[model samples]
Target: YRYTGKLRPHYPLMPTRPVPSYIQRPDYADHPLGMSESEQALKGTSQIKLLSSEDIEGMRLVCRLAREVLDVAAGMIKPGVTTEEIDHAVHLACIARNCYPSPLNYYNFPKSCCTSVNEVICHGIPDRRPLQEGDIVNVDITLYRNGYHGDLNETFFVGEVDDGARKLVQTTYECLMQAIDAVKPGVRYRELGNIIQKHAQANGFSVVRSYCGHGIHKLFHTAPNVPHYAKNKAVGVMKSGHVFTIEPMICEGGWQDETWPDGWTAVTRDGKRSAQFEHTLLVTDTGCEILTRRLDSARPHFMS
Candidate 1:
């Protein structure tokens, strides 16, 4: 498809990287077509996993490891590095930690992680395009280990960016954070969109409605679908054990998306810019815990 963004497919994509046989793989990992049979069986289903104590422990370990891998990829971002290079690093980092890059082969997504640049919203397939100076990119990372999945992502600034891009990126980060603060045992899953929408609009940015945060655990993508735009028809209430991601894809132009021919990249139809931030959250008795919180070694993208 002839798209509207500066980004386009630099295919053919590289062959899938190999994971050690000892590392646990997702149901679709080895499928020739990358079809996730277990995920396919969940069609039209709305069940959310209420994690047990053991599950929580597993989540903690996997999420921390996911953060480690994300940091590995994030640290490599610069003016001239290719997203493909970042993807290879992510794959290596995941295997080094004995975790599977959850995005790989999940619904046939080829890359180990997603690298959404400027006009791209999410699910951007990594390619040979070297990141440029003053550009912003979002790296969506998910790690699977011991039958649990950890999901999180962050948009980064390449070299130095303009004030407008910086504002959009910082606001996108706040949009997710504010919505997360509203998370608790009794909060409605849909209200997250309301919080995000208000903040984005108030800042003159728009919220991309095509993609929303999702419930993740043993299943890479599942129930309690959390939409990020307002008045969304998303169902379910947050429960204490509910684990999901509230990644908000905020854009500089209209909240519409156009997919690339590769069928994985989603970009802004208006050819403008976008930013996103995500965290796999566990609704707690009081509020919640950011499973993939940034580490001390993590560098901040929002410059003062």
Candidate 2:
């Protein structure tokens, strides 16, 4: 069964452009940590096999393809190109790499990938909308190849942006990095939320209480759902065999979000802008490992 939000029936329609002004812009105050209800358990448990030296090498190869596809998808951003066009680029990249776009049919999502624009909290479905300047876009990349899966995402500036947007995006990136730094063996898993929540609150930004990071290995998702907000009841400690994501969805406005009727795209309940960054990592015996690393690549953009 598709894991829709707790209140799927109440989500409003996908608002037409010139979003209604009466639609309030959400703020950190709207869905502060502990205000929202608990997240449902993951659809299934993550089965993370203990990676060996050869296994690590194979995953790194898959990671490279993930980066390349993200770069290609990022290149398609601009005022004229539609989200569907971006989706096409991502599809082609995955095919070229002999990998499958894992998200294409998973839960019946329409697009080959997710292209969330301004005000989209996460899982923004690719569509016909043209990207505009001063917009923020988040591209999520997950690929399957060589019997492994690699997942990662990052929010990019669509065009010329104001100071507030830039601050939120940059700070959100730092928050994800800090959370990753806390991923060595024996590091408490819940501490990841402490690091993320503290940085977000300190910078005057809010962490999305709705979504969170998860473990990814042989299966698309499994155990240890990592919530980016503080005081979450996330289980398990970092161990040598653990491999998962550290994706924290952040927003410039209210942390609370509502899903669109399309049933995949998540947007700020108050229509405020959102940003996020993700990395697939491994907890090694010594410390942590960054499975997916981008090369010197051109920056992606955010389109309205």
Candidate 3:
């Protein structure tokens, strides 16, 4: 199902919303159709309990495997590769490693990995769309292995891209890493959002308020909802074995986003590009251990 070097010009490059090729929208309590719920949920719900050390270790293996899977999927990121093809690679890779593609059956999502292209923000399902040369894509990979879950994602560049697009994507990645590095034995969970939002603002990007990081180990979406925007009342302190993710979804323009008619896929509301990077992290006695580290990949060198 690899792309055949054809662009859907009829499909507007500046999409006000996601293309309706996936499933119909769901009535999820968190996010309604083409809407965001952060301002309404400011009081926030209960913080889910963190995972134990042993559980973190199990999640570690799954995260590492997810990194390798991302590497393999990224290597095939060239012209003419269909999102569906990449999804196949991801599903097979996880299956071969004795892991379940976490998103495959979760909430009835059919895609193995989320393939977000251009204005499509997140949760874009794999389809016959061929990635164009100037387009940017985000691949969200999560795995359910050994009774735990691991989640991570990256916005990848196509063959050639504009400087603005590159900066937005790279800065978003830096924001995620900075947030991860801020995790320590006693650091406050709310502080992570501040660091991420500051970094994003400094780089001329906006932190997405609608979607944020989450505590992920046993259940998919758990305690400590990590908001990307600053000044959120997100509580809790990082403990010895706290496992979570610090994914900041940054947009180049307005932080608002709109869902497609299908309901699941979200895109930038202003038709601008948004990028995100994620890592499954564990708070140790030291600082943090990125369980989703890709040794052979181009690791981001922390600045400042």
User: Which number leads on TM-score?
Assistant: 1
**What TM-score would each prediction reach against the true structure?**
0.96, 0.82, 0.83
Q: What are the per-model numbers of colliding residue pairs? A: 0, 9, 5
Regions of candidate 3 where Cα sits further than 4 Å from its true position: 1-50, 297-304
Q: TM-score of predicted model 3?
A: 0.83
The digit string of per-residue lDDT tens for model 1 on 38-142 reads 877986787787999999999989999998888888789898899999999999999999988888887788889999989988888999889999889999899
Candidate 3 at residue 134, lDDT? 82
Tens digits of per-residue lDDT, candidate 2, 260-283, equal 767778888777778998899989
Give each model's whole-structure lDDT.
Answer: 0.89, 0.73, 0.73
Question: Rank order by TM-score, top first?
Answer: 1, 3, 2
Cα RMSD (Å) between model 1 and the true structure? 1.5
Clashes of 2: 9
Q: Residue 153 CA error for candidate 2 (Å)? A: 0.7
In the predicted model 1, the residue pairs found to clash are none
Q: Which prediction has the highest lDDT against the true structure?
A: 1
